[PDB]
Amino acid sequence: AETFYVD
Amino acid sequence: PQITLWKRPLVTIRIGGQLKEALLNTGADDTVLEEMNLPGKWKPKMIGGIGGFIKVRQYDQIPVEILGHKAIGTVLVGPTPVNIIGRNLLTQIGMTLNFPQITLWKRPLVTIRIGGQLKEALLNTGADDTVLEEMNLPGKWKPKMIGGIGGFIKVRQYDQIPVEILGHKAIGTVLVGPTPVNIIGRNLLTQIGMTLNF
Read off the CATH number of the domain in which B186 is found: 2.40.70.10
Which of the listed residues B64, B99, B134 is the one where a domain comes to its end? B99
* 8 Å CB contact of B49 and A2: no
Domain, as residue range, for B88: 1-99
3-state secondary structure at position B89: helix
- B49–A4: do the CB atoms touch at under 8 Å? yes
Structural determination approach: X-ray
Which domain-ending residue is among B99, B127, B150? B99
Same domain? B59 vs B132: no
Same domain, B123 and B30: no
Quick check: B127 contacting A, CB < 8 Å? yes
Do B82 and B140 sit in the same domain of this protein?
no
Phi, psi dihedrals of residue B191, rounded to the nearest 5° = -65, -35
Q: What distance in Å separates residue A5's CA from the closest CA in chain B? A: 5
- Which domain-ending residue is among B99, B116, B145? B99
Q: Do B56 and B24 share a structural domain? A: yes
Asked whether the CA dihedral B179, B175, B116, B137 is positive or negative, the reply is: negative
CA nearest neighbour of B39 among B20, B15, B8, B56? B15
